[PDB]
Amino acid sequence: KVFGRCELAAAMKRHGLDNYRGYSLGNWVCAAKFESNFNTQATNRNTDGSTDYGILQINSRWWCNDGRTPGSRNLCNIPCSALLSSDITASVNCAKKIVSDGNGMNAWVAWRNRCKGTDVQAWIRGCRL
Numbered sequence: 739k740v741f742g743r744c745e746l747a748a749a750m751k752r753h754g755l756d757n758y759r760g761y762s763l764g765n766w767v768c769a770a771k772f773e774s775n776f777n778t779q780a781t782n783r784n785t786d787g788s789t790d791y792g793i794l795q796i797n798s799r800w801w802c803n804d805g806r807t808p809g810s811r812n813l814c815n816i817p818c819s820a821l822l823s824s825d826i827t828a829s830v831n832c833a834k835k836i837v838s839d840g841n842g843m844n845a846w847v848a849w850r851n852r853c854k855g856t857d858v859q860a861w862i863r864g865c866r867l
């Protein structure tokens with residue numbers, strides 16, 4: 739599923755990502771924009787052999803099981819395919835664990851490089867929330 743911008747903002751808010759760990763909703767929408775262009779089916783292979791899955795490009799080295807990432811973990815206790823669903827629940831629940839891991843949203847390199855320190859509220863401007 740390719741979400742609309744305000745559609746995704748609303749779904750993230752309903753799933754409790756608004757201000758989760760202090761990160762306002764626009765931070766999460768911005769991260770999703772640059773990680774996946776709002777496409778739940780996005781996948782990308784990393785140079786280390788792991789793969790990133792879903793709207794927030796959650797990696798299989800630590801967070802989900804894809805059966806093909808040697809020596810990896812599955813700390814969200816989910817198949818990576820669950821992160822590709824039109825229903826964002828699994829991605830949100832795993833993102834909550836990731837963002838609590840110690841480095842906040844810096845876990846998402848693209849958030850650090852493209853969202854952090856910017857006017858992230860623009861990503862939710864105009865949305866009925």
Ligand SMILES: [Cl-]
Binds near residue numbers: 763859862
């Ligand atoms: Cl915001």
Ligand SMILES: [Cl-]
Binds near residue numbers: 759841842843
């Ligand atoms: Cl933080």
Ligand code: NA
Binds near residue numbers: 799801803812
């Ligand atoms: Na894994």
